[PDB]
Amino acid sequence: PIPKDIAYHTLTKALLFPDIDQYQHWHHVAPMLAKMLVDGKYSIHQQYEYLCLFAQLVAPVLGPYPSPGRDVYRCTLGGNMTVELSQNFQRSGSTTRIAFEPVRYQASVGHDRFNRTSVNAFFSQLQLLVKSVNIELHHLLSEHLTLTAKDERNLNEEQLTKYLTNFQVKTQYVVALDLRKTGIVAKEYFFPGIKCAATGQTGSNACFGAIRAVDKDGHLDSLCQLIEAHFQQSKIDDAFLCCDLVDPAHTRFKVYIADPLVTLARAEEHWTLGGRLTDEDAAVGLEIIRGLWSELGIIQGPLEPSAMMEKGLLPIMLNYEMKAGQRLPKPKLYMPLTGIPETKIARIMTAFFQRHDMPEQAEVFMENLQAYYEGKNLEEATRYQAWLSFAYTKEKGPYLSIYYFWPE
Amino acid sequence: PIPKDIAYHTLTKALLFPDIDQYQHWHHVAPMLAKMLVDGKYSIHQQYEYLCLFAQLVAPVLGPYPSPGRDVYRCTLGGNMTVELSQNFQRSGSTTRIAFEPVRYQASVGHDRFNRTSVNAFFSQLQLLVKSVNIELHHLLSEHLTLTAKDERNLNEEQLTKYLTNFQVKTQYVVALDLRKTGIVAKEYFFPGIKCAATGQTGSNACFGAIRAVDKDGHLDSLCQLIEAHFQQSKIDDAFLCCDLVDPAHTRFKVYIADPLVTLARAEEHWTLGGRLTDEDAAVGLEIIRGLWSELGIIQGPLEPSAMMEKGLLPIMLNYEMKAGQRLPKPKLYMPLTGIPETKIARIMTAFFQRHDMPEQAEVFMENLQAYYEGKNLEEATRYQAWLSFAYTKEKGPYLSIYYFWPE
Numbered sequence: 137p138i139p140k141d142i143a144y145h146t147l148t149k150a151l152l153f154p155d156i157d158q159y160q161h162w163h164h165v166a167p168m169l170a171k172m173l174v175d176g177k178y179s180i181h182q183q184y185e186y187l188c189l190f191a192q193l194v195a196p197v198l199g200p201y202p203s204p205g206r207d208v209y210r211c212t213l214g215g216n217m218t219v220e221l222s223q224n225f226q227r228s229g230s231t232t233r234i235a236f237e238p239v240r241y242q243a244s245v246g247h248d249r250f251n252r253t254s255v256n257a258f259f260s261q262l263q264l265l266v267k268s269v270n271i272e273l274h275h276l277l278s279e280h281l282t283l284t285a286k287d288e289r290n291l292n293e294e295q296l297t298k299y300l301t302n303f304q305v306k307t308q309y310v311v312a313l314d315l316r317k318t319g320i321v322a323k324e325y326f327f328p329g330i331k332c333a334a335t336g337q338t339g340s341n342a343c344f345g346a347i348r349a350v351d352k353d354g355h356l357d358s359l360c361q362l363i364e365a366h367f368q369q370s371k372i373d374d375a376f377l378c379c380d381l382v383d384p385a386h387t388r389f390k391v392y393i394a395d396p397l398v399t400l401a402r403a404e405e406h407w408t409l410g411g412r413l414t415d416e417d418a419a420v421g422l423e424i425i426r427g428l429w430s431e432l433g434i435i436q437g438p439l440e441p442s443a444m445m446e447k448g449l450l451p452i453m454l455n456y457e458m459k460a461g462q463r464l465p466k467p468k469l470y471m472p473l474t475g476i477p478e479t480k481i482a483r484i485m486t487a488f489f490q491r492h493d494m495p496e497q498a499e500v501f502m503e504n505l506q507a508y509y510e511g512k513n514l515e516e517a518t519r520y521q522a523w524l525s526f527a528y529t530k531e532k533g534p535y536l537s538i539y540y541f542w543p544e
Numbered sequence: 545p546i547p548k549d550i551a552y553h554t555l556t557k558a559l560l561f562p563d564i565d566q567y568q569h570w571h572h573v574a575p576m577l578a579k580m581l582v583d584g585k586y587s588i589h590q591q592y593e594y595l596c597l598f599a600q601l602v603a604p605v606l607g608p609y610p611s612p613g614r615d616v617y618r619c620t621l622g623g624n625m626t627v628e629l630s631q632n633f634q635r636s637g638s639t640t641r642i643a644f645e646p647v648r649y650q651a652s653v654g655h656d657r658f659n660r661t662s663v664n665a666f667f668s669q670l671q672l673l674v675k676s677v678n679i680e681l682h683h684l685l686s687e688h689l690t691l692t693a694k695d696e697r698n699l700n701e702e703q704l705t706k707y708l709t710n711f712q713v714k715t716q717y718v719v720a721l722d723l724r725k726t727g728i729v730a731k732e733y734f735f736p737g738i739k740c741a742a743t744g745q746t747g748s749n750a751c752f753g754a755i756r757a758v759d760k761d762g763h764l765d766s767l768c769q770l771i772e773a774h775f776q777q778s779k780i781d782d783a784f785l786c787c788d789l790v791d792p793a794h795t796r797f798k799v800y801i802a803d804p805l806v807t808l809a810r811a812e813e814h815w816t817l818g819g820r821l822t823d824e825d826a827a828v829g830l831e832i833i834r835g836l837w838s839e840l841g842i843i844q845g846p847l848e849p850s851a852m853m854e855k856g857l858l859p860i861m862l863n864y865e866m867k868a869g870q871r872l873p874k875p876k877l878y879m880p881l882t883g884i885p886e887t888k889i890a891r892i893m894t895a896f897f898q899r900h901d902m903p904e905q906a907e908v909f910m911e912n913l914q915a916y917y918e919g920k921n922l923e924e925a926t927r928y929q930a931w932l933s934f935a936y937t938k939e940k941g942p943y944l945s946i947y948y949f950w951p952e
C-alpha cells in the first residue's frame with residue numbers, strides 16, 4: 137500500500153542533484169519532511185511545493201555532508217547537522233518548520249571561517265521564490281550582532297578557544313522557514329557570542345542595542361527595560377536575537393537566553409521575569425509548565441558545560457517575544473528532552489492533548505513519531521525528541537513545538 | 545475554484561531556473577502539459593513527477609528561446625519550436641507524449657552546426673533518472689543514419705541549400721518520451737536526409753541498411769523486403785527511422801515516409817503497401833480511414849514544397865512498424881489537419897469516439913481542447929491540431945494520437 141513518504145519517493149524519480157552532498161542531504165531530510173507535511177494536513181500540492189523548495193533552495197546551502205571523521209565546518213542543529221526540523225502543535229492544527237545554517241564548502245576550506253557570506257547568497261535565491269520575504273532587518277542587524285572585520289582583527293585565539301569549548305560552533309546566522317499553509321514566513325537568528333568575545337560587550341547588551349537602533353521611536357522600549365532588569369537581577373549576560381524577515385514595523389523580535397541550571401524553580405523565575413509578568417495567561421501557563429515538568433521528569437545536568445555536553449544534556453532556554461503594539465513581553469519555555477525515552481514523552485504528550493481538548497493530536501502522536509523514525513525502537517531512543525517549547529494565550533490555547541534530532 | 549493547471553502553478557512557486565530560456569520554455573510548455581496529464585487520468589503524484597522531470601531534464605536541452613527575429617538554430621516541432629506535445633487516445637485511456645530536439649546554444653553560435661553532441665549530453669542525464677532507458681541503439685544507428693565527419697568534408701553548400709529549401713531543418717536526432725503510467729519509454733528518431741545529400745545514397749536504403757546491421761540474424765528481413773518493394777514500385781527514396789531505446793532484441797523499428805500528394809487514394813496505396821498487406825485489421829482500418837478522411841475533408845495542397853510551406857500545409861506520412869516475432873508490418877497513417885478549424889475536428893473526433901464505444905473520450909474532448917488553448921477561439925483557429933495519427937488492431941481497437949502546434 138501507498139507509503140506515507142510517497143511525495144519524497146516521487147520527487148526522487150525527477151530531481152537531478154548536481155553534487156553528492158545535496159543528494160545526501162535530500163535523502164537524509166526529505167523522508168521525514170514528507171511525513172510531517174502529511175501529518176499537518178497540508179494539501180498534496182503544498183506538499184510537493186515545499187519538498188521541491190527544500191530541494192531547490194535549501195539543499196544547496198547545507199554544505200558538505202558531515203560524514204563521521206570528515207573535516208568540515210560543523211554545526212549542531214538537529215544534534216550534528218546544518219539543518220533541523222520542528223513541528224508546532226495547536227488546537228488549530230500542526231505546522232512544520234525547517235531551521236538551518238546557510239553554509240557553503242568555502243567555510244570548511246579556509247575561505248570564509250566565520251561563514252558570513254553564505255546567508256547573503258541564500259537570501260538572494262529565497263527572495264526570488266517568496267516575494268513576501270524582506271531582508272531589510274538582516275542589513276540593519278548584522279553590524280550589531282555579528283563579527284565585523286574590525287572585530288576580527290581585535291580577536292585573539294585564546295578567547296575563541298574559550299568560546300568554542302563552551303559553545304562549540306562558529307555560527308553567526310541561522311535561518312528558519314515557517315511552512316504555513318498561507319505561505320512561507322522566514323525568520324533569522326543572530327548569534328553575538330563571538331562578536332562579544334572580541335569587543336568585551338555582553339550578548340544581551342548587544343541584542344538590546346540592536347533592537348533600539350531599529351526601533352527609532354521607542355514602542356518596544358518599556359518591554360526591553362523589563363527584560364533587561366530581569367537579566368541584570370538574575371546575572372545573565374549571554375543572549376541571542378530572532379526576528380521575522382518582514383517589514384521592520386511589522387516584525388516581531390525575540391530575545392533568547394540559556395540557563396544551565398535545569399530545575400523547575402529556575403524555569404519558573406525566568407518564565408515570570410522574576411515576578412514582573414502578572415498577566416492571567418502567564419499564570420495559567422506556569423501551572424501547566426509545572427505539570428509537564430514533573431510528568432516528563434526533565435533531567436538536571438551539571439552547570440559545567442564540559443560534563444553537560446559529555447552526557448548529552450541540554451540547558452533550559454527561553455525567548456521573550458516583543459511586537460510594536462504589544463502591552464507585555466510574551467514568554468516561551470524550551471524544555472530539554474534528551475535522556476528521556478521517546479515512548480515516555482509520547483505517553484505524556486498524548487495525555488496532555490487529551491486534557492486540553494486536542495483529541496486529533498492525541499490520537500496520532502505516537503504512530504507519527506514512530507513513522508518519522510521507522511523501524512527504530514522508541515523505548516530505547518532518548519535523543520530523537522530533544523526539545524519541547526511551550527507558550528500560552530487564553531484565546532488560541534497551548535502552543536507547543538517539538539524540535540527533532542537526526543537518528544544516529 | 546482550483547484551476548486545471550494547479551500543478552504548474554505550484555511547481556512555479558518552487559523551481560529556480562538558472563537561465564531565461566529555460567524559464568521561458570517552462571512557462572510556454574508546462575501549462576498545457578499539466579492539463580494533458582490531468583485529462584489522461586494520471587495520479588497527482590505521477591503529474592508532479594513528469595512536470596518536474598520536464599523542468600529538470602528536458603528544459604535544459606530545448607536551446608535558446610526562439611523569439612521572433614532571433615538568430616538561433618531553428619526546429620519545426622510544434623510548428624516552430626524544439627519541442628512538441630502529443631496525446632494518444634484509446635479505449636484503455638489517454639497518454640501524453642513529449643517530443644523534442646535536444647539542442648544547446650552552441651548550435652546557434654558556430655560551435656556545432658549539425659547539432660550532434662546535445663543528444664549525447666541529454667541521454668547522459670536521462671539515464672540517471674530512468675534506469676530502463678538503454679541507448680545501445682543510439683551508438684549502433686548513428687553511423688548509418690547521421691552525418692559523420694567524413695560525410696561533412698564531402699558535402700558542398702549547393703546541396704545543403706537544396707535540402708534546406710525543401711525540408712528546412714538541419715536536425716539529425718529527435719527524442720520522444722512516452723509518459724506511460726508504468727514508466728517512461730524513450731524513443732529516438734534519426735534523419736538521414738543530410739547524410740544522404742552528402743553520400744548520394746537514398747534515405748530508405750540508409751534506413752534499411754541500418755536495420756540490417758542491427759538485425760544480425762534476419763528476423764526482420766522479410767518485413768523489410770515487403771516495404772522495400774513498395775517503396776521501389778511507388779518510386780519513394782526519402783525515409784526516416786524510429787526505434788525504442790530498450791534492449792536491441794526487444795525494440796520496435798518504425799520506418800517513416802512523407803508523400804506530398806494529399807489524396808485519399810495515395811494514402812490508401814501506402815496504407816496497404818500497394819496491396820501487399822492482406823490482414824483483416826488492415827482492411828477494417830482502411831474503411832475507417834475512408835470515413836475520417838471524408839469527414840475531416842483533409843486538404844490537398846500542391847506537390848511543390850515551396851508553395852506547400854507558404855499556405856501552411858503538410859504532407860501525409862506513414863510509418864511501418866516492425867518487431868522481432870511480428871508476422872506482418874503494421875501501418876500507421878498521419879493525416880494533416882492544418883487549415884481545418886479546430887471545432888470541426890472536435891465535432892468529428894467526438895462523433896468518432898461515440899461510434900467506436902469510447903463515451904468517456906467523446907464527452908470531454910472539446911472542453912479539454914478549449915482548455916489547452918484557453919481564451920482562444922476554436923472556430924477561427926486552424927493550426928492548433930496539426931496531425932491525427934491512426935492505427936488499428938482488432939483486440940485493442942482504434943489507435944489515434946493528436947499532435948499539437950503551439951499558438952501564435
Ligand SMILES: O=C1N[C@@H](Cc2c[nH]c3ccccc23)C(=O)Nc2ccccc21
Pocket residue numbers: 211212213214220235305307308310312325327394539
Ligand atoms: O545548535 C544550536 N542550537 C541553538 C538553540 C536552537 C535549537 N534549535 C534551534 C533552531 C533554530 C534556532 C536555534 C535553535 C542554540 O542555542 N545555539 C546555537 C548557536 C549557533 C548555532 C546552532 C545552535
Ligand SMILES: O=C1N[C@@H](Cc2c[nH]c3ccccc23)C(=O)Nc2ccccc21
Pocket residue numbers: 619620621622628643713715716718720733735802947
Ligand atoms: O518538424 C519535424 N516533423 C517531422 C514529423 C513529426 C511531426 N511530429 C513529430 C514528432 C516526433 C518525430 C517526428 C515528428 C518531420 O517529418 N520532419 C522533421 C525532421 C527533423 C526535425 C523536425 C521535423
Ligand code: NA
Pocket residue numbers: 473474475476477478481517518519520521522
Ligand atoms: Na528524548
Ligand code: NA
Pocket residue numbers: 881882883884885886889925926927928929930
Ligand atoms: Na487544425
